[PDB]
Amino acid sequence: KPNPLQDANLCSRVFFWWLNPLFKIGHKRRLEEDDMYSVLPEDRSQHLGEELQGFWDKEVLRAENDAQKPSLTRAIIKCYWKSYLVLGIFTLIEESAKVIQPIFLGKIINYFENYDPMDSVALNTAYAYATVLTFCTLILAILHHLYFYHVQCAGMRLRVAMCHMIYRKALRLSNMAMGKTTTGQIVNLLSNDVNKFDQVTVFLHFLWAGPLQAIAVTALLWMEIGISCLAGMAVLIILLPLQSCFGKLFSSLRSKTATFTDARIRTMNEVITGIRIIKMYAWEKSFSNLITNLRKKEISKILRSSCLRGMNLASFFSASKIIVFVTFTTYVLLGSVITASRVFVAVTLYGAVRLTVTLFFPSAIERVSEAIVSIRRIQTFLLLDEISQRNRQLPSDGKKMVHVQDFTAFWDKASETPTLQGLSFTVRPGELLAVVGPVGAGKSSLLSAVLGELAPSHGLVSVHGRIAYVSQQPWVFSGTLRSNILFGKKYEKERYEKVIKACALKKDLQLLEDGDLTVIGDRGTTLSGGQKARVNLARAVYQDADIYLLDDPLSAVDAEVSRHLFELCICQILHEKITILVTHQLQYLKAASQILILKDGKMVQKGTYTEFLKSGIDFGSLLKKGFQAYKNYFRAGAHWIVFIFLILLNTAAQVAYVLQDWWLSYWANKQSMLNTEKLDLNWYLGIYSGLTVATVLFGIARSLLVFYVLVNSSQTLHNKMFESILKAPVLFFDRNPIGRILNRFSKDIGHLDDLLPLTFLDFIQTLLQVVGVVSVAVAVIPWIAIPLVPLGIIFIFLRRYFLETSRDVKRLESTTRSPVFSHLSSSLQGLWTIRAYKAEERCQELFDAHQDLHSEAWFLFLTTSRWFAVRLDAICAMFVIIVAFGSLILAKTLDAGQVGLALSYALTLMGMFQWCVRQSAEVENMMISVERVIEYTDLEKEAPWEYQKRPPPAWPHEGVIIFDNVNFMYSPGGPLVLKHLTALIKSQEKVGIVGRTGAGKSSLISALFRLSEPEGKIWIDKILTTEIGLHDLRKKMSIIPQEPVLFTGTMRKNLDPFNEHTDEELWNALQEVQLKETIEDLPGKMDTELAESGSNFSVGQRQLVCLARAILRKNQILIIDEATANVDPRTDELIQKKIREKFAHCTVLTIAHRLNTIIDSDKIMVLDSGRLKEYDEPYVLLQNKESLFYKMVQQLGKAEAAALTETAKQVYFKRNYP
Secondary structure (H helix, E strand, O other), X not given: OOOHHHOOOOHHHXXXXXXXXXXXXXXXXXXXXXXXXXXXXXHOHHHHHHHHHHHHHHHHHHHHHHXXXXXXXXXXXXXXXXXXXXXXXXXXXXXXXXXXXXXXXXHXXXXXXXXXXXXXXXXXXXXXXXXXXXXXXXXXXXXXXXXXXXXXXXXXXXXXXXXXXXXXXXXXXXXXXXXXXXXXXXOOOOOOOOOOHHHHHHHHHHHOOOHHHHHHHHHHHHHHXXXXXXXXXXXXXXXXXXXXXXXXXXXXXXXXXXXXXXXXXXXXXXXXXXXXXXXXXXXXXHHHHHHXXXXXXXXXXHHHHHHHHHHHHHHHHXXXXXXXXXXXXXXXXXXXXXXXXXXXXXXXXXXXXXXXXXXXXXXXXHHHHHXXXXXXXXXXXXXXXXXXXXXXXXXXXXXXXXXXXEEEOOOOXXXXXXXXXXXXXXXXOOOEEEEEOOOOOOHHHHHHHHOOOOOOOEEEEXXXXXXXXXXXXXXXXXXXXXXXXXXXXXXXXXXXXXXXXXXXXXXXXXXXXXXXXXXXXXXXXXXXXXXHHHHHHHHHHHHOOOEEEEEOOOOOOOHHHHHHHHHHHHHOXXXXXXXXXXXXXXXXXXXXXXXXXXEOOEEEEEEOHHHHHHOOOOXXXXXXXXXXXXXXXXXXXXXXXHHHHHHHXXXXXXXHHHHHHHHHHHHHHXXXXXXXXXXXXXXXXXXXXXXXXXXXXXXXXXXXXXXXHHHHHHXXXXXXXXXXXXXXXXXXXXXXXXXXXXXXXXXXXXXXXXXXXXXXXXXXXXXXXXXXXXXXXHHHOHHHHOOOOHHHHHHHHHHHHXXXXXXXXXXXXXXXXXXXXXXXXXXHHXXXXXXXXXXXXXXXXXXXXXXXXXXXXXXXXXXXXXHHHHHHHHHHHHHHHHHHHHOOOOOOOOOHHHHHHHHHHHHHHHHHHHXXXXXXXHHHHHHHHHHHHHHHOOXXXXXXXXXXXXXXXXXXXXXXXXXXXXXXXXXXXOXXXXXXXXXXXXXXXXXXXXXXXXXXXXXXXXXXXXXXOXXXXXXXXXXXXXXXXXXXXXXXXXXXXXXXXXXXOOHHHHHXXXXXXXXXXXXXXXXXXXXXXXXXXXXXXXXXXXXXXXXXXXXXXXXXXXXXXXXXXXXXXXXXXXXXXOOOHHHHHHHHHHHHHHOOOOEEEEEOOOOOOOOOOOEEEEXXXXXXXXXXXXXXXXXXXXXHHHHHHHHHOOHHHHHHHHXXXXXXXXXXXX
């Protein structure tokens, strides 16, 4: 994929003209990784990394020779100074241009100030000055982008060199070093700590041309306006500390909010996850209250933080008005007088130095400080102790031979019992050596000793030859299955097919779409554990090394596959290979050439299978231990009248900003046409102060009102979204995962709250400033409205043309960034596997290739940005040239105040225009959050929680439940689950439900609670369910769900969220389940904060909590759902006995998956894939052998069948026949 930046001119690289084809292509279709351009050779990851590694190695040698610490920063500087110095040359030129062009502005205004319509020599010198002014604007506009590309390319090169060095290290960390750190701190110095180097360079040079300029400018001001410049400059210095009190107080109101935001998101997680239970109990008003309170407590702090950001923006807006006000107040008070060529040079010089001081210099400080933090971090990482290269081998006779003599070693050096005790054994080619022992005996430790991972404290190990290894856990990296198998080696058809047929992957390869060519993710999300183990073993076999080490391969696979692998792949193929095995299944031991027993890290006996048959010690004996989006966004915040007031207040802020400078223009023009007659200073300083105060007050009012209206819009959108997600039916929670639902209450509301009001105000602020600049120019020279129409069509077409490809190349550099992260993670997890084979100088090449495919789309992200910006600066510089020259061809009607004003405003357009365009794109970016929040704002709704026909309070009186021809389905158009159900449940009668798992067993509860309004009729005491609002149906039917949940809060909350009970009642109920005792020993009596669904409680304890809930609610209908699956028998019988002896007069429906619990149920529904088949007493059902109850019982066995039959008969006799 050849790169055109390699073949370009210099005129064609100043203008990024070499990038035109990409845009054309991106304009038609979408861009994918094939359109993208391969990187310049000086920019490949391996080249950069090797260079910086050379410098860092030489410098750590220098330090080790000099006996102190080595510095990474010193190596970075030594490698990159001879090329970050030339960038410094251009930034010196550019900053002197910024300080020079106000001087020629002065000289043009000074041509007007002394006009003579006949003198042509003066006009010619003024044209010369206009030409020099335009050369400065074309050095700041057109050449700053080939520079800035190189400034940013330097940082990309530094980040890529660091990523390479970090990986080269992380591929050789000694095990004791891999212990201290984690595989999270080795992706957190590469996902956020090396991303600093992209940013540092951008402003690095603003540490010596941020002070230097602020001296040059001050010296110039002293030449023009005199000592008064100090006044102005004083104010400008006070914007460095003050802007750093809006920073040590915004982070005090912003880290005080996350402690409410994160509580709210945790509660929303418990609301969304357990939504079936919340609905079924009718509790969502309680969670409404909890999240309403946490959100109100969070908006209070978002509202302080927004008032402070609004004040910060208003201060940055009216700073220039204050600087110039105080300068020319002291200038005119000390006896001087305002002329219009010193005024609009002082204004312009303040503009330049104020932009440097308040934005660039402090950014440079902060980013260099963070980059030094990150360089320290990587400094520490690149010095973790490393594995000694497996050194010179003892010269042997070439035998592929494994021996150990008197080995004894530790994983950590403080242990009491050594990890290994005096190990001394050997293995030859062809000998399928094995070891048998319990877990903790250390067969992993023995294999790690073989692989060099265990450092010998005493003795010796001799391993000679190529080795293949299979880890206890399968390890699959990023790639395809054949890529996994080859592991960098060249493919061979027959050698691959032999291993495939040996590994019985044929069924597994058929399971995937591409056969063997399907792409496997990280940890193998595309495969299963057995499949991953098979792929790893196939890789090991195909690698064809002298030694094989196999660990725990066949414990996690089935019978036939494991047998086939052991015999036809291990026993037969590898009978000509050195073998060492870790096994847990004794059935394979018969094939073992040798077997060793290891226990407490020590030898017991080694010998064949028959010899250990002779020893008489059993193995098992030892084995056992749009635009509607904008309209709907703004309409939430405030009525339309407030939007009209907001428009007026934006306009008055900007009009007053401009009328202050026009006042200095009018003051100057009125001073010049004078006479001694003196100019009335009270009047002029009065209106000048009035205009400065109006600028400041209207900027402050405008910012706070934009912020307030948009934060209130956020608050209204959240309240409406949340109250619409509490009422969405459970279908909406089935279709969408808990991740997607909660992602709009955390992220998107997180943009609406603290980032969309800020950005949307910064855009409006700078847009009105651009309109102020263009309006002063047009109002002075009205003909500028003709050139300015083709400069506003060209802008629109440019921006469409760009954003049609800047958006295809701002995902290409995100969809290609993550494979680097993933490769580092994967090569850390299976690092032992990687190093076991000598094949890591191919994993380095893989990391380079993954890091040359992201520093290939960062290249296009850097240069498409400059393509666009060169053209916006062409537009803006044509505006400045038209103003500066159209003002001299019209010199007869203009005068020095008008020209000064128009032209210093045009000069300030430089950079403002681009910031406005950037922010507009960023607003349109961040409005997707609003589209999504408004999309959950209008979900479907289930029936209302209340109806007109309220139920009588005593209902249900009895609990007589009637089913009249009920059809129930989860979704419209989906399969029916119940088909014309018809039944009568007489009061108090205990009824069981039986059938197949999903034969309609699970939908009786959903139909009875109207979790999906059903078709048919259901009556409770002659009241149809569909005629009463939900919370008057779900309140009156207590349920014991399959897996209970505890909600974060006091145990009094879990038993009475609505405070309908007295603490003595709760104590009584907790005593009924005998759990009262277990509670009054925790710190809080009942107010103990709990974990997520009672991790500090037992499943049986959770069931006790839910059964207490039911006893407390004491409604005369009760439903139990899949009582016990894995409950301990004590708790089993406890729950069961309480269920019967607490609910004597309560109608009960039980839905059980075992027949023991519901054998005594007075009646039993039987379901057949959604059909009511049998409904009668259990003994009557068991009489008929054709009855599905009898058929299902006979599945159980013979003894259990007879016992259950006896139980049914006894119950039948005791109940019906006294």
